[PDB]
A paper describes a structure:
PRMT5, an oncogenic target for various cancer types, has many inhibitors manifesting little cooperativity with MTA, a co-factor analog accumulated in MTAP−/− cells. PRMT5 activity requires a crucial partner, called methylosome-associated protein 50 (MEP50), which dramatically augments PRMT5 catalysis by increasing substrate recognition and presentation. MEP50, a 7-WD40 β-propeller protein, binds PRMT5 via contacts with the TIM barrel, making a hetero-octameric PRMT5:MEP50 complex one of an apparent D2 symmetry. The octamer methylates a broad spectrum of substrates, including COPR5, SWI/SNF47, pICln48, Riok149, Menin50, etc., and making targeted PRMT5 inhibition a potential cancer therapy.
Surface plasma resonance (SPR) studies detected that 11-2F binds to PRMT5:MEP50 with an apparent KD ~13.6 μM without MTA, but its affinity increased drastically to ~82 nM in the presence of 25 μM MTA, much better than its synergy with SAM and S-adenosyl-l-homocysteine (SAH). Cryo-EM structures of 11-2 F / MTA-bound human PRMT5/MEP50 complex and its apo form resolved at 3.1 and 3.2 Å respectively show that 11-2 F in the catalytic pocket shifts the cofactor-binding pocket away by ~2.0 Å, contributing to positive cooperativity. The PRMT5:MEP50/MTA/11-2F complex was prepared by mixing stock solutions of MTA and 11-2F with 0.4 mg/ml PRMT5:MEP50 (~0.09 µM) on ice for 30 min before being applied to glow-discharged QuantiFoil grids. Movies collected in a Titan Krios were processed as outlined in the supplementary information, yielding a cryo-EM reconstruction (Coulombic potential map) at a nominal resolution of ~3.1 Å [Fourier Shell Correlation (FSC) at 0.143]. To our satisfaction, the 3.1 Å cryo-EM map clearly shows the density expected for the inhibitor inside the catalytic site of PRMT5, right next to the co-factor binding site (marked as MTA). The density for MTA, is well resolved, and right next to 11-2 F. The top pose from AUTODOCK is very close to the final refined model (yellow vs. green) with only one rotation of the quinoline group by 180 degrees after refinement, suggesting that a cryo-EM map of 3.1 Å contains sufficient details of the ligand for selecting and refining the top poses generated by computational analysis, leading to an accurate model of the ligand, even though individual atoms in two multi-member rings of the quinoline are not resolved in the cryo-EM map. The nitrogen atom of the 2-amine group on the quinoline ring and its nitrogen at position 1 form strong H-bonds with catalytic residues Glu 444 & Glu 435 with N-O distances of 2.41 Å and 2.86 Å, respectively. The aromatic ring of quinoline is stacked in parallel to sidechains of Phe 327 and Trp579.
Residue numbers in the entry:
A (entry chain B): 21 to 244, 247 to 329
B (entry chain A): 13 to 637
Write the structure that this text describes.
Amino acid sequence: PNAPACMERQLEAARYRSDGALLLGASSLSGRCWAGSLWLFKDPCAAPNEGFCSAGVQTEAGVADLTWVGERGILVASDSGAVELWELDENETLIVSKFCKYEHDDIVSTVSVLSSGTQAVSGSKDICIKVWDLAQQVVLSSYRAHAAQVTCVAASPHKDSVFLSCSEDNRILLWDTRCPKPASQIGCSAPGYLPTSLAWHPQQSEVFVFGDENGTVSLVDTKSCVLSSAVHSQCVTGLVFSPHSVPFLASLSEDCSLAVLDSSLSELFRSQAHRDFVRDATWSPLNHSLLTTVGWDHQVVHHVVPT
Amino acid sequence: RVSSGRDLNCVPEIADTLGAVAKQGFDFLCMPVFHPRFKREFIQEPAKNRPGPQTRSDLLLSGRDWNTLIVGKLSPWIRPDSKVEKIRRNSEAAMLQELNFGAYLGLPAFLLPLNQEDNTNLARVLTNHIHTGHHSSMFWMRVPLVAPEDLRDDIIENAPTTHTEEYSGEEKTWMWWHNFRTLCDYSKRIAVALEIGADLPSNHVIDRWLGEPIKAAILPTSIFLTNKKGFPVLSKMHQRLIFRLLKLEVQFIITGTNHHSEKEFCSYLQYLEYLSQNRPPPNAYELFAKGYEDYLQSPLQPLMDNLESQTYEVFEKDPIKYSQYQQAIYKCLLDRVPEEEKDTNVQVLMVLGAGRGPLVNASLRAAKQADRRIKLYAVEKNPNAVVTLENWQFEEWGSQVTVVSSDMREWVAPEKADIIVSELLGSFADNELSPECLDGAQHFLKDDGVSIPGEYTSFLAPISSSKLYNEVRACREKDRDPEAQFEMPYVVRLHNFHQLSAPQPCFTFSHPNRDPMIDNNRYCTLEFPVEVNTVLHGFAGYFETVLYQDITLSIRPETHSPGMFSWFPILFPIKQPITVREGQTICVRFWRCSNSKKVWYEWAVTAPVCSAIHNPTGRSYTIGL
Ligand SMILES: Nc1ccc2ccc(CNC(=O)c3ccc4c(c3)c3c(n4CCO)CCCC3)cc2n1
Ligand SMILES: CSC[C@H]1O[C@@H](n2cnc3c(N)ncnc32)[C@H](O)[C@@H]1O
C-alpha cells in the first residue's frame, strides 16, 4: 500500500507514540543494496509483516537512528551524513520528505530532541557535535569538545538547554547552552572503561545512568559515590526507563539477552528470545507491563514483565 | 596531471557511485568493503552463527575495476589494541577477514588508521598477513599532522586546553609513525598518507616528513576558504605545502561533505589543478634527471675498466663544463706568453685521459682565441677510444695533434710540457684515483708549469631517508657477505630526503705536488650540530674544483654550477639507523687508505653513539689501480 514490497533484513529501531502506534526503522547491512526504510504500524502485533503496515517509505541511505517530533515528525539520523525530516500526512498514509541537509562529514550516529520541541542535537563519527533548529532547518551552533567518535547523546526531559554526551575518549560531558563554556566534565568514580550509552532519570532532574563496554551499569548523582552492578557479559549498548511512578530500567547488550532491573539494579526479569544482536527496546504507553524489542534477527518480540 | 580520488563512507550502490565519481573527474574511490556498522561476532554463541552473506559480491565489477579503481578501508569498529580481551579477540579476527578479502579482490591499496601511541597488536596482525601467502597489495597508514586532542576547542569549564608550549606535543604524530614502522621492519609495502588540517606546524616537523614514504595526502573540504566569488581556495601557507607535495607526485584524496554545494563538488578539483598548472617549470637539470629519482647506481672505475662509447656520448652532453675549461686554458696561455714573443713561442699542452677528444677541440679553440701557438699531445689508454682519435687526427686536426696510446703513468714523453689538462674527477673528486695518475704524470711537467685543475676538494653532510635505507637493503646478492651492501658507495640522484646540516670540507688535493714523500693517504674528523629530533641514515657528499684562478665548477647545493648536470652526489650509508636528539652533535670519521694494488675508504660514526667500521681493508669495496 504505497510502500515497498520488502522490508530489509535488519531491524534497528523502534518507538511508540501515546496512541499505541509504533514506528520501526530498518536497513540492509549486507547484500547488493545498502539503504533502509521507515515503517508505521497501528497494530503492534502485526509487525514486521509488511502486508499489515499502515505506511512506509524507502530511504536513500541506511538509518542509524530516528525519533519522534511531536506527533507527526520523524527525525532521522542517516549514514549519508544527512540530517533529515519526514512528516506524516493527514491520512497517516504517506510519509512526506520535508527537508534534507548534509551537515556532517561522516555517519550521523545519534539524534535526539529537546523538551522545548524546537531544538535538536546530533552526533557523528566525526568528532563534531551540532545543535539544530527544527523550525528553520538550520544549524545554530557546533562544538568540538570530544576527540573521538561520539557514541551517545541525550536530552534532559526537564531543561531545554541541557544535554549529555560521551565518546570514545572516556570523557562524559554535561552541556548547558546558556554558558560561555557550555560543557562541564562529570568525571567518574569508576574510570578506566569506555561508556557505551546514556539515559536521564525520568523524575529526578539531577540523576542519570550510563552503561559501559564491560556489561556494567551505573547510577550516578550529577552533583557528586556511585551505585553499580554488573549485568551483561558484553557491552551494554542501550538503556531505557519504563513509564511508571516507580521506574524500572531496561537493559540491552551485545550478548543478545535482555534484562529488566529494579532501582537497586537488582535483576527482576531476564529473556533470551533473540538470536542476534538486539538493537533497541521501548515501552508501550498503553500497557505498563509490556516491553517491545527489535533487532538483527528480524524478530519482533513482545515481552510481559512480571512487575 | 595530478591524480586524485574521492573518499566516501556511504555507498548505497557501487555502480552508480563509481559512475558519479568518474563523472566528476576522479581517478579512484576509497570505500569500505563491509558496511561499516555491521559488526561481526566471532567465538561467542549464537552470534557467530549468524546466517547470510556478509557483504556484497564481487561479480558486480569487472576484474579490471577491482584492481584499478578501488582502495579499501578497515571498518572503524575494529580496535586490536583495546584493553578488554573480548574486544581484542574479535578485533583480530575482523582485521584478518577484511585483509584477506581485499587480497582476494586484488585491491591495489588498503587504508589503516593510526590515532594513538600503542599500536602493537595492529602491527602484529599486519605483519603476519604480509608474510603469509603471496600478495601485492600496498598498505597505507593514515596519520594526522596534529593529534586530535590538541585540536579540540576550549569550551569545557573544568578541562582547559594546554595553553603553554609543550615542545614534544608537536612531534607526537611523527613518533607514532616511527614506532609502527620499526615494529614492521620497514617493509616496503607499508607507506603513509597524511591528513592535513587547518592548523599547520611550524616549518619544522614539515621538513621531517620528507624522506618519508608519502604516497598520498588527504584534504578535507573543511579547510577551504571561500573567496569573493564563492569558490573554495587555499590559504597561502596551504598553497606552499601543496607545491612542495607536488614534487613527490603524491596522490590527492578529497574527503568530507560538500560545504559549497551551490558550486558543484568537482570545483575542488578544479582549484587543485589550477595550482599545479601555475607551478614554475623545471630547469634543464631537473628535466635531465627525470626518471632517476632515488635510483642507485654503482660508480664507474675508468682506470680499470674500459668505458664503452655510450658512456662517453653522455659525458659530452653538458656544454657548460667545456666552456669553463676553455676559459681556463685561454687565460692560462695569455698569462704565460706576452704579445712580444707571440709568434716565436710555442707552448706545449698535454691532455691526459683524452677520451674521444672533446678537450682537444676545446684546447684548440682556446688557442685560437688567445692567438697563441701550441702543440698538443693526446694520451689515452682505452684502445676503443684511441681508434676514434686516429680518425680525428687524420681527417681534421692534422699534424698539430699527436696521438699516443698508453698508460700515462708508464709512458715516456719525448718532451716536457708546461700545461697539463685533465678530466679525472669523479663524483667525490678523488675516487677516480686522480692524484695517483697525476703524480705519476708529474715528471714530464716543466718545473714552472701548471696543472688544470690545480685544486680540488670534497664535502660531506649527514642525511636522512628511510626510502633510501630500503633501497640499499634490497641490494643483496647470493654467495656474498649479506651486509656487504652497506659498505660501498652509490651514485644517486637524491630527491626524497632530508638534510640534517650544512656540508663541511673533508679531503683536499692540489697539483703539482712538490713535497717530498707526499703521501696520498688521509684522515679527517668532522662534526655537525643537530636542531631536529631525527634519524641518521647515511652521509652524502659533493665536490668543488678550481680550473684556474677565478674559474670553478661545483655541485655543492649552495654553489652549484648554473646548469651543470652530468654529475650526481655520492651516498655513503651506515648499517644501523641512529637516533639523534636535538642539541647533540654528530661526529664522523673518514679514512683514505691504500696499498700497492688498491685504494679504499673506511668510515664510522663515533658520536652520539658509536657504530662499526664500514668497509675495513676494502673487503667490500675497492678501487683498483
Ligand atoms: N672522469 C670522469 C669524467 C666525467 C664524469 C661524469 C660523471 C661521473 C659520476 N657518474 C658515475 O660514476 C656513473 C655511474 C653509473 C652510470 C653512469 C655514471 C652512466 C651510466 N651508469 C650506469 C652503469 O653503466 C649509464 C650510461 C650513461 C652514464 C664521473 C665522471 N668521471
Ligand atoms: C674524460 S673520461 C676519463 C678518461 O680518463 C682516461 N684515463 C683514465 N686513466 C688513464 C690513464 N692511466 N692513462 C690514460 N688515460 C686514462 C679514460 O680512458 C677516459 O678516457
